[PDB]
A and B are shown apart, each in its own frame.
Chain A
Amino acid sequence: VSELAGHQTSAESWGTGRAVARIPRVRGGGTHRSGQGAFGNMCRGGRMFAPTKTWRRWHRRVNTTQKRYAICSALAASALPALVMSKGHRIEEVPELPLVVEDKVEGYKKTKEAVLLLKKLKAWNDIKKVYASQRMRAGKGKMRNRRRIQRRGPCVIYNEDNGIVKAFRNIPGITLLNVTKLNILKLAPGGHVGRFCIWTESAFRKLDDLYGTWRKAASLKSNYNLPMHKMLNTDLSRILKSPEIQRALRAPRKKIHRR
């Protein structure tokens, strides 16, 4: 809000001795705005409490290792189709969820051929769901250039630009990501970690040249290894039904002794 808003008036307050109550009012005049009231958040016109400033701390910087950790968790939950269906991607005919396609995908230059590729990979139901979910936004965002909304669809990861960005361009839902330029805001939109992703061969082979394994460095970054698990075997059902614990466990007390 502008600094001049509310203080362009010259309103000296009527003091004590009159029926008005101590508000800065407009000096003189035969106007409707004459002895009216300004210089307060409670007044018609005037300025508000706490004028919003340009020097608010708008931007947030995160640690680089935390950003790499979150993007590795997003790439790890790009697998595991229980996390992909709980995101909301229709998956029912997808043949293998780490969907790795040829290096001829970058060679396409036609959206008809891209739609045909999505139909043969049977991921077209997500785009169909985007077409079904194209509707109007609720609220005052329509007069703020935010008119229409839709779902996010199959995020396609490309290695080189040879026409894949021109091809998966008007098909609604597909976000394109470069291999070395992966974005957290597109790999986990809205904070939810799972996302249906379509890889290429030269992307699925270059992930190992980006982040490596646990016993190898990043080999494209300077100083970055993979993080370690806090616990390795997370199948605690199998852990607790293993005989090595139940040999040492005692007998329960489950007889409900009521009053």
Chain B
Amino acid sequence: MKFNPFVTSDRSKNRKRHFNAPSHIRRKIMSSPLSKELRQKYNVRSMPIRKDDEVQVVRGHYKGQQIGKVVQVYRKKYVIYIERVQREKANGTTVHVGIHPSKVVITRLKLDKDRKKILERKAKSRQVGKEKGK
């Protein structure tokens, strides 16, 4: 259960805070888990996805083992566009079919200084939590 009386835990209110969330909260909602090699290397469970991360599609009709780069992260519909995850229209043009990032695993990150300090902060928090649980 929840014991904090400030946490919402309401049906319509949580749906409101989900579907009317601003962009910096949508970035945290649209986070995806990492592969087992990346989890062993960084001790990081999940990360928000970026413009040019490498992605395997886990569930859906477009399920496969192909590592596809993200085309772009569209945070209004809570979706991402990947390179080879596309589909031909009636007029022959290909449109990228969006996949929700919960059905998305990261195989390679695009590392900059902000992502390095985020992963170091999360690894430090995991180390403090493991020391408190030990």
- Interface positions of A (Cβ within 8 A of B): 142-145, 147
* Most chain A C-beta atoms within 10 Å of own C-beta, residue among B9, B11, B12: B11
Q: Tally of A-B residue pairs with Cβ under 8 A?
A: 8
For the complex of A and B, list the 5 residue pairs with the smallest distance between their C-beta atoms, beginning with the closest.
Answer: A145-B11, A143-B11, A145-B10, A147-B11, A143-B12
**In the complex, how many angstroms separate the beta carbon of B2 from the nearest chain A beta carbon?**
12
Q: Give 8 A-B contacts (CB < 8 Å), ordered by A residue.
A: A142-B11, A143-B11, A143-B12, A144-B11, A145-B9, A145-B10, A145-B11, A147-B11
B55 to chain A, nearest CB (A): 32
A interface footprint on B1-30 (CB within 8 Å = 1, 0 otherwise): 000000001111000000000000000000
The docked-state distance in angstroms from the alpha carbon of A142 to that of B12 is 11
Complexed CA–CA distance, A143 and B12 (Å): 8
Q: Which residues from chain B contact A144 at a C-beta distance below 8 Å? A: 11
Chain A residue with Cβ nearest B13: A145
Residues of A within 8 A of B10 (CB): 145
> Considering residues A142, A143, A145, A147, which has the most beta carbons from chain B within 10 angstroms of its beta carbon?
A145
Query: Which residues in A have their C-beta under 8 angstroms from that of B11?
Result: 142-145, 147
Q: How far is the CB of A237 from chain B (nearest CB, A)?
A: 48
The contact size tier of chain B is under 10
CA distance A143 to B13 in the complex (A): 11
CB proximity of B127 to chain A, nearest CB, Å: 22
CA distance A239 to B12 in the complex (A): 63
Alpha-carbon separation in the docked complex, A145 to B10 (Å): 6
| Distance in Å: Cβ of A137 to nearest Cβ of chain B | 12
Q: How many whole Å from A133's CB to the nearest CB in chain B?
A: 19
How distant is A161 from chain B, measured CB to nearest CB, in Å?
15
Tell me the complex Cα distance, A145–B15, Å: 12
Extra contacts besides A145-B10, A147-B11 (6): CB < 8 Å: A142-B11, A143-B11, A143-B12, A144-B11, A145-B9, A145-B11
The complex places the Cα of A147 from the Cα of B10 at a distance, in Å, of 11
The residues of B that contact A147 with a CB separation of less than 8 Å are: 11
Residue of chain B at shortest CB distance from A143 = B11
CA distance A142 to B9 in the complex (A): 13
Q: Whole-angstrom distance from the CB of B93 to the nearest CB of chain A?
A: 42
Distance from A143 Cβ to chain B, minimum over Cβ atoms (Å): 6
| Complexed CA–CA distance, A147 and B15 (Å) | 14
Annotate B48-68 by CB proximity to A: 1 below 8 A, 0 otherwise: 000000000000000000000
In the bound complex, what is the Cα–Cα distance between A143 and B10 (angstroms)? Answer: 9
**Bound Cα distance from A196 to B49, whole angstroms:** 50
Nearest-CB distance from A247 to chain B (Å)? Answer: 64
Mark B74-114 against chain A: 1 for CB-CB distance below 8 A, else 0.
00000000000000000000000000000000000000000
Report how far A143 CA is from B14 CA in the complex, Å: 12
The chain A residue sitting closest to B9, CB to CB, is: A145
Q: In the complex, which residues of chain B have a beta carbon less than 8 angstroms from the beta carbon of A142?
A: 11
A153 CB, nearest partner CB in chain B, Å? 16
Contacts of A145 in B (CB 8 A): 9-11
- In angstroms, Cα B11 to Cα A144, docked, is 7
A142, closest chain B residue (CB):
B11
Per the bound structure, the CA–CA distance linking A93 and B10 in Å amounts to 40
Give every chain B residue within 8 A of A143 (Cβ-Cβ): 11-12
Complex Cα gap A145–B8 (Å): 11
The answer for the CA separation of A144 and B9 in the assembled complex, in Å, is 11
Q: Which residues on the A side are within 8 Å of B12 (C-beta)? A: 143
- Alpha-carbon distance between A142 and B10 when the two chains are bound, in angstroms: 11
CB distance from A241 to the nearest CB of B (A): 54
With both beta carbons as reference points, the residue of chain A lying nearest to B10 in the complex is identified as A145
Give Cα A161 to B62, complex, Å: 53
